[PDB]
């Protein structure tokens, strides 16, 4: 209801790269939990941590926070499975964690589609998993496909149809500028029109003859740094060739 | 199909022989715990003993020599799982070590009798207190060497053990008196050396054995006699006070509840005392003679991490 | 003249510098202004505050033309330390950080374009006080709490440095009953800062002065805990003045005494005498028309004000660090195992 299975096995079968967080260490090692099957928990031994004997002041800084690991051995019925993060390449940080981050963002969408719709999370999860995460890779890149490749929405039955609407609402910023056209001319209107015809094609609003409120959309918030500046430059260019005066805030 | 907890393995062999003592009996039970119950995975093995040691503390809460045995067995299997054998050999690599302490910690006491010879010298009147059996094996070696000395046994009240030691070595053939523990302070001037033995060693060097080893220790420091203490290398526990108050048996050492019908009134005070580093001066290990500052460092050398 | 401790030259009263060869940081003068005119620190408050100005002063690099950044800052920062030496000579909380910092000056190569010079130093010297101070103090909390029962008393001396946070945890974050006895002394009433804080925290605080010290001990009293300034290689506690008189008395009155401390506050040096290695601080302070004036110019008069003093390690029962507890004779074994090793 809060979290559940990923890939229809009770345990992360031998040699699959997983992620855990370290909770506490007393003498055995860490009492980690498997972040793909969150409520289940395994553990790691002290020699399978960092090779240098880790001091207790070095030990305390790493609890709570998470990392990447692989599993050494698996009990078929006990949850007491053996971890391995020492014998893990650095590429699995790129491989597993972004794959897990691609599975963290489907946790963000399947929570309000479950509990704010008041159904348990696993039943509308396990309608998704086998035709998506077993037919091919798991469904978040397919969720950027299923907004345009609609053989997936009909490839499985919808047990509810609120979830079909709540997906495209989520997955599918304004920089304010108060530019002051303080003109005293005769060909200024034309200039203004010209300016409009390049800076808007982002959100440009007339306030009066001098004041204009333009809220330039940014994608990385820092990509509108190259937009606003450009607009300003254009404005500067514009008014020297017509006769008036534009001043920018 | 055993469970190794209370008596289905442990209290069997405590009626076998009163030569094995309490902590290595727990060590004998703990090494045979994972020997038969070897659940082919490093994870739940230590989770089995963490279940098993904590109920063993719960089994007898007031025999904290067992807690020292519960302490260092985890210290055994930790570094034995170290050398990095990925649990593949370390199942066999632990149990090929295995029967170490039933071959090595059983020969603690004779190795104490190997190196504890040159303390009881020519004509030393010896003050002993409580059945710490490593002392008697040192005294067994003293009679077998035919070195000349005498002996004085105190009480062990209420634990009665002083009556045993008088009977235990008079048949061995040593001139000996049993004295009351009340008459220590008027006799200790003639006494030259004094031997006791702890149930466990605390972080500064602790005497966590009996009722009044701290009483006879603080007598000996004003008598300015070398207050020796005899133990061995598996009698260490982290449990460490700041006063002479440990965990008690069940209640505070000054109770004031009343006698209901006929309840025992000598048993109202404590049964375990504490002595810090100040009143001991030397101790014996299987590693050798040990100063009271080195017993702090070796109890911290593999204990911080 | 017979002891001639007035002619023990551990400090003078020299001031009034004017030199401008170095580009002196203005804010590091404020740190020395905040110390010497009226002392506002313990020892780890200095170890914070010495680090507070160091993150700012490295950010203004000002590296010259023909000089590597490894070559100038070993002179540039170290010239500013002598400003502090005019104000107040260093501690080991000063000392162990700065020689560790001089390692970091030396282990850099001529490759940094001075934009990378921030974050390789900034977070690293931040993870110093994150590890060596903050979560080091976190391990103090759980260790001391299990050694304290409810409905008992604590006797502290002066302003504490780390066990203020310990007393906040047991009174509020664990809510077990506790009574607090804070005693400080003329002239530095730094214990009143704790007396403000813990009653602002709402706990039973009994303020005291060291002249009335016996009647505190004549009541229900135990668990004397202490702040610290450094631990000697023997086990002597070099700490604030007047620490040992309760440390002798409470040990004489058979209730145990502990010293809350850390591995950063250890030291390689060793001595066993109180008036050998110390610091004097401006003998005008023990006056407050006054009652007397003229320790100067008058025949046969002097004012001493001892800052630091040793306590015998036999008085201390248990020494608690972030790694755990330890008896006070076993102090220097961490010097070979953790300090410079951990």
Domain ranges of chain A: 16-91, 92-172, 173-248
What the block records as the tokens of C149 is 């029962």
Statement: A173-248 belongs to CATH 3.40.50.300: no
Q: If you search the block for the tokens 């220790």, which residue do you land on?
A: B217
Distances in Å between the Cα of A105 and the Cα atoms of A8, A118, A132, B155 are 20, 20, 16, 74
Cα distances from B112 to residues B106, B226, C147, in angstroms, run 11, 18, 35
How far apart are alpha carbons B181 and B157 in whole angstroms? 8
**CA–CA separation, C182 vs B281, rounded Å?**
36
C338/A60 Cβ within 8 A: no
Interchain contact, C330 vs B297, CB within 8 Å: yes
Q: Cα(A226)–Cα(A216) distance, rounded to whole angstroms?
A: 10
Q: How far is CA B224 from CA B194, B295, C295, in A?
A: 11, 22, 50
Query: Do C240 and C339 share a structural domain?
Result: yes
User: Do residues B65 and B51 make contact, with C-beta atoms less than 8 angstroms apart?
Assistant: no
Contact predicate C98/C81, CB 8 Å: yes
CA neighbor of A106 nearest in space, from A32, A55, A166, A160 = A166
> Within 13 Å and on the Cβ side, how many CA atoms surround B162?
22
The one-character DSSP state at B157 is T
Q: Which parts of chain B are beta strand (E)?
A: 125-128, 150-153, 176-178, 193-196, 227-230, 282-284, 289-290
Residue with tokens 């989770």: B47
CA torsion C119→C125→C126→C132, rounded to 10°?
150
Q: CA-based angle B131:B106:B66, to the nearest 5? A: 60
Resolution (Å) of this entry? 4.6
DSSP label at residue C293: -
The last residues before gaps in chain A (C-N over 2.5 Å) are 172, 201
How remote is the C-alpha of C153 from its chain's centroid? 24
User: Residue C181 in 3-state DSSP?
Assistant: strand
Are B296 and C317 a contacting pair at CB < 8 A? no
| Separation of CA A58 from chain center | 31
Read off φ and ψ for residue A93, nearest 5 degrees.
-65, -40
Distance from CA of B48 to the nearest CA of C (A): 26
Dist CA A170 CA A147 (whole Å) = 11
The number of beta carbons lying within 10 Å of the beta carbon of residue B293 is 14
B278 close to C314: Cβ distance less than 8 angstroms: yes
Among chain A residues, the shortest Cα distance to C262 is held by A57
* Residue among C325, C286, C315 nearest C302 (CA): C286
Question: Nearest C-alpha of chain B: how many angstroms from C269?
Answer: 20
Q: Which two tokens stand for residue C49?
A: 């505050």
What is each CA distance from B163 to A219, B132, B185, B229, in whole angstroms?
Answer: 90, 13, 20, 20
| Cα atoms in the Cβ-side hemisphere of radius 13 Å centred on C47 | 28
Instruction: Please provide the size of chain A in residues.
Output: 249
Burial of C132 (0-12, 13-18, 19+ CB in 10 A): buried
Quote the minimal CA–CA distance from A38 to chain B in Å.
18
In the numeric block, the tokens 């706990």 are attached to C203
Strand boundaries in chain A, DSSP class E: 17-21, 33-34, 66-73, 82-84, 174-180, 203-206, 211-217
**Residue with tokens 């702090």, as numbered in its chain:** B296
Task: Looking at the structure, tell me whether residues C229 and C292 fall in a common domain.
Answer: yes
Asked if residue C65 lies in contact with residue C10, where contact means CB atoms within 8 angstroms, the answer is no
Return the bridge partners of C209, or none. Answer: C184
| CATH number, residue B234 | 3.40.50.10470
Q: How many CB atoms lie within 10 A of CB A86?
A: 15
The residues facing A83 across adjacent strands are A71
Instruction: With CA atoms as reference, report the closest residue to C213 among C237, C264, C249.
Output: C249
The answer to whether the Cβ–Cβ distance between A57 and C130 falls below 8 Å is no
Assigned CATH for A92-172: 1.10.150.190
Contact predicate A34/A21, CB 8 Å: no
CA quadruple B33, B34, B37, B40: dihedral, nearest 10: 170
Determine if residue C259 is left, alpha or beta; phi over 0 gives left, psi from -120 to 50 gives alpha, anything else beta: beta
Are the beta carbons of B49 and B72 closer than 8 angstroms? no
Cβ under 8 Å to B: C residues 38-67: none
DSSP state of A132: I
Last residue of a domain, one of C85, C109, C139: C139
With contacts defined as CB-CB under 8 Å, which chain B residues touch C150?
none
Parallel, antiparallel or unpaired: strands C318-320 and C257-260: parallel
CA nearest to A17, candidates A87, A76, A78: A87
The DSSP H or E segment spanning A32 is none
Rounded to whole angstroms, what are the CA distances from B299 to A26, A126, C84, C326? Answer: 17, 55, 42, 10
Tell me the residue range of the domain where C58 lies.
1-139
**Do residues C180 and C205 make contact, with C-beta atoms less than 8 angstroms apart?**
yes
Residue A245: exposed, middle, or buried by beta-carbon count in 10 A (0-12, 13-18, 19+)?
middle
**C-alpha of B277 from chain center:** 17
DSSP H helical ranges for A113-246: 121-125, 129, 140-143, 162-170, 188-199, 225-240
- Dihedral sign from CA coordinates of A62, A63, A69, A74: positive
Phi, psi for residue C325 in degrees, rounded to 5: -110, 155
Which burial class, exposed, middle or buried, applies to B102 when counting CB atoms under 10 A from its CB (0-12, 13-18, 19+)? middle
Nearest by CB to residue A60, choosing from C132, C135, C342, is C135
Nearest chain B residue to C223, by CA: B242
Which tokens in the block code for residue B2? Answer: 């055993």
| Interacting residues of C61 by C-beta distance below 8 A, sequence separation 6+ | C69, C114, C117
Closest CA to B76 of B114, B118, B111, B26: B26
Chain B interface includes C256 (CB < 8 A): yes
Taking an 8 Å cut-off on Cβ atoms, the answer to whether A75 and B86 are in contact is: no
SS3 C230: strand
Instruction: Answer yes or no: are the C-beta atoms of B270 and B254 closer than 8 Å.
Output: no
Of A47, A72, A78, the CB nearest to B82: A47
C181 in Cβ contact with C238 (< 8 Å): no
Distance CA C337, CA B172 (A): 49
Shared-domain flag, residues C10 and C73: yes
Q: A54: nearest CA in chain C?
A: C342
Task: Quickly count: other Cβ atoms within 10 Å of residue B157's Cβ.
Answer: 16
Give CA–CA dist B63/B236, Å, rounded.
14
B305 touches chain A (CB under 8 A): yes
Cis ω before C187 (30° cut-off from 0): yes
Tokens of B289: 């003679």
Buried/exposed code over C173-186 (b: 16+ C-beta within 10 A; e: otherwise): eeeeebbbbbbbbe
What's the Cα-to-Cα distance from C146 to each of B72, B235, C149, C225, rounded to whole Å?
21, 23, 7, 14
Instruction: Check residue B258 and report its DSSP letter.
Output: P
Whole-angstrom distance, CA of residue C159 vs CA of residue C167: 13
Structure tokens at C211: 């002249």
Q: What are phi and psi of B278, to 5 degrees?
A: -65, -30
CATH number for domain A16-91, candidates 2.40.50.140, 3.40.640.10, 3.40.50.720, 2.20.25.90: 2.40.50.140
Q: How are strands ordered across the β-sheet holding A66-73?
A: A33-34, A17-21, A66-73, A82-84
Residues B158/B272, Cβ–Cβ less than 8 Å: no
Domain's final residue, options C81, C115, C139: C139
Give CA separation, B218 vs B151, B215, C16, C31, C67, in Å: 20, 5, 60, 52, 68
Listed residue (C26, C29, C46, C40) closest to C230, CA to CA: C46
Give dist(CA C96, CA C107) in Å, integer.
17
Measure the CA–CA gap between C217 and C220, rounded to whole angstroms.
7
Q: B183: which DSSP letter?
A: G
Q: How far apart (Å, rounded) are the C-alpha atoms in residues A176 and B111?
A: 86
- Residue A40 near residue A28 (C-beta atoms within 8 A): no
A174-180/B227-230 β-pairing: unpaired
Dihedral pair phi/psi, residue B120, rounded to 5°: -75, 95
- Write phi, then psi, for C46 (nearest 5 degrees): -65, -45
Q: Is A108 on the interface with C (CB under 8 A)?
A: no
Give the SS3 label for residue A143: helix
User: How does DSSP assign B53-102, residue by residue?
Assistant: HHHHHHHSTT-THHHHHHHHHHHHHHHHHTTT-TTTTHHHHHHHHSSSTT
Compute φ and ψ for C157, nearest 5 degrees. Answer: -140, 130
Residue C8: count other Cβ atoms within 10 Å of its Cβ: 13
C-alpha neighbours within 13 Å on the C-beta side of residue B26: 25
Residues B208/B90, Cβ–Cβ less than 8 Å? no
Cis? peptide before C274, omega within 30° of 0:
no
Cα(B230)–Cα(B132) distance, integer angstroms: 8
**Closest residue by Cα to residue B114 from B295, B289, B299, B256:** B289
Element at C53 (helix H, strand E): helix C44-59
C95 with C241, same domain: the answer is no
Contacts of A59 (CB under 8 A, 6+ apart): A25, B305
At C67, is the secondary structure helix, strand, or coil? coil
Same domain (yes/no): C307, C158: yes
User: Domain containing B121: what range?
Assistant: 106-302
Q: Report residue A142 CA to chain centroid gap.
A: 15
- Report the alpha-carbon distance of residue C217 to residue A158 in Å, rounded: 77
**Contact at CB, A47 and B74, closer than 8 angstroms:** no
Q: Tokens 């200039």, residue?
A: A191
Number of domains in chain C: 2
Residues 6+ apart with CB under 8 A from C256: B242, B243, C222, C223, C224, C250, C317, C318
Of C327, C302, C321, C339, give the one whose Cα is nearest residue C141.
C321
Helices of type H across B161-292: 161-170, 213-223
B289-290: strand order across its sheet: B176-178, B150-153, B125-128, B193-196, B227-230, B282-284, B289-290
Q: Which of C139, C165, C197 is the last residue of a domain?
A: C139
């Amino acid at each position: 209801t809060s979290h559940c299975r990923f890939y229809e096995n009770k345990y992360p079968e031998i040699d699959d790269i997983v992620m855990v967080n370290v909770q506490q260490i007393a003498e055995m090692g860490a009492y980690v939990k498997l972040l793909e099957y969150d409520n289940i928990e395994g553990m790691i031994l002290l020699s399978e941590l960092s090779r240098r004997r880790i001091r207790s002041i070095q030990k305390l800084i790493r609890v709570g926070k998470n990392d990447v690991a692989v599993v050494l051995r698996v009990d078929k019925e006990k949850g007491y499975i053996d971890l391995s993060k020492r014998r893990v390449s650095s590429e699995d940080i790129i491989k597993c964690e972004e794959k897990y981050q691609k599975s963290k963002t489907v946790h963000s969408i399947l929570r309000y589609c479950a509990e704010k719709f008041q159904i348990p999370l696993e039943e509308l999860y396990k309608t998704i998993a086998w035709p998506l995460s077993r037919k091919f890779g798991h469904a978040y890149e397919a969720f950027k496909l299923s907004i345009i490749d609609e053989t997936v929405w009909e490839g499985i039955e919808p047990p509810s149809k609120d979830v079909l609407d709540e997906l495209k609402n989520y997955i599918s910023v304004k920089i304010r500028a108060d530019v002051e056209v303080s003109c005293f001319s005769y060909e200024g209107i034309d200039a203004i029109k010209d300016a409009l015809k390049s800076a808007e094609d982002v959100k440009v609003k007339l306030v009066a003859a001098p004041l204009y409120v333009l809220t330039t959309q940014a994608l990385d918030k820092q990509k509108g740094i190259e937009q606003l500046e450009s607009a300003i430059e254009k404005i500067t260019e514009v008014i020297t060739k017509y006769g008036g005066v534009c001043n920018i805030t | 199909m055993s469970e190794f907890n209370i008596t289905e393995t442990y209290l069997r062999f405590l009626e076998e022989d009163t030569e094995m003592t309490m902590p290595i009996a727990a060590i004998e039970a703990l090494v045979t715990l994972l020997r038969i119950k070897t659940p082919e995975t490093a994870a739940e093995m230590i989770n089995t003993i963490k279940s098993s040691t904590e109920e063993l503390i719960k089994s007898i809460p007031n025999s904290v020599s067992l807690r020292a045995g519960c302490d260092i067995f985890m210290r055994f299997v930790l570094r034995n799982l170290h050398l990095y054998g990925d649990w593949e050999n370390c199942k066999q690599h632990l149990i090929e070590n295995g029967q170490l302490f039933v071959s090595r910690a059983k020969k603690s006491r004779n190795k104490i009798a190997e190196i504890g010879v040159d303390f009881i010298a020519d004509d030393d009147i010896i003050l002993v207190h409580g059945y710490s059996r490593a002392v008697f094996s040192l005294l067994n070696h003293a009679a077998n060497k035919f070195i000349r000395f005498r002996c004085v046994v105190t009480e062990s009240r209420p634990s009665k053990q002083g009556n045993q030691l008088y009977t235990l070595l008079e048949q061995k053939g040593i001139p000996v008196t049993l004295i009351v523990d009340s008459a220590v302070g008027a006799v200790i001037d003639k006494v030259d050396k004094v031997f006791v033995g702890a149930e466990g060693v605390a972080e500064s060097g602790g005497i966590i054995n009996l009722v009044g080893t701290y009483s006879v220790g603080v007598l000996a420091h004003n008598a300015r006699k070398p207050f020796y203490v005899v133990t061995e290398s598996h009698k260490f526990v982290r449990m460490f006070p700041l006063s002479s108050d440990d965990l008690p048996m069940a209640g505070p050492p000054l109770d004031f509840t009343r006698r209901t019908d006929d309840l025992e009134d000598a048993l109202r005070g404590p049964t375990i005392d504490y002595t810090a580093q100040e009143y001991i001066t030397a101790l014996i290990t299987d590693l050798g003679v040990l100063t009271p500052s080195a017993v702090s460092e070796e109890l911290i050398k593999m204990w911080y991490d | 003249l017979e002891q001639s401790f007035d002619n023990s030259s551990l400090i003078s009263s020299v001031k009034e510098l004017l030199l401008n060869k170095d580009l002196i940081h203005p804010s590091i003068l404020l740190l020395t202004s905040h110390l010497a005119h009226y002392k506002i620190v313990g020892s780890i408050p200095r170890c914070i505050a010495m680090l507070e100005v160091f993150q700012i002063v490295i950010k203004d690099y000002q590296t010259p033309k023909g000089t590597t950044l490894s070559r100038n800052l070993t002179s540039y920062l170290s010239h500013q330390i002598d400003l502090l030496k005019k104000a107040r000579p260093l501690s080991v909380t000063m000392g162990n950080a700065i020689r560790w910092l001089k390692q970091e000056i030396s282990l850099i190569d001529p490759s940094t374009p001075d934009k990378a010079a921030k974050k390789d130093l900034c977070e690293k010297i931040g993870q110093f006080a994150k590890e060596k101070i903050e979560l080091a103090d976190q391990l103090i909390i759980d260790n001391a709490s299990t050694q304290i029962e409810e409905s008992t008393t604590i006797v502290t001396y002066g302003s504490s440095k780390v066990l203020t946070e310990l007393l906040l945890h047991n009174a509020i974050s664990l809510k077990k009953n506790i009574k607090v006895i804070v005693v400080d002394s003329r002239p530095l009433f730094e214990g009143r800062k704790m007396a403000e804080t813990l009653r602002n925290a709402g706990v039973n605080v009994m303020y005291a002065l060291i002249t009335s010290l016996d009647t505190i001990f004549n009541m229900d009293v135990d668990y004397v805990f202490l702040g610290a300034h450094s631990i000697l290689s023997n086990g002597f506690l070099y700490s604030r003045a007047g620490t040992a008189m309760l440390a002798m008395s409470a040990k004489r009155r058979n209730i145990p005494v502990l010293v809350c401390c850390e591995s950063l506050k250890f030291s390689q040096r060793v001595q066993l005498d109180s008036v050998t290695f110390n610091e004097l601080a401006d003998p005008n302070d023990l006056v407050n028309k006054n009652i007397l004036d003229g320790w100067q110019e008058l025949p046969s008069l002097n004012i001493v004000n001892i800052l630091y003093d040793l306590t015998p390690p036999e008085y201390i029962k248990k020494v608690i660090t972030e790694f755990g507890a330890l008896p006070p004779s076993s102090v220097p074994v961490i010097l070979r195992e953790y300090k410079g090793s951990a």
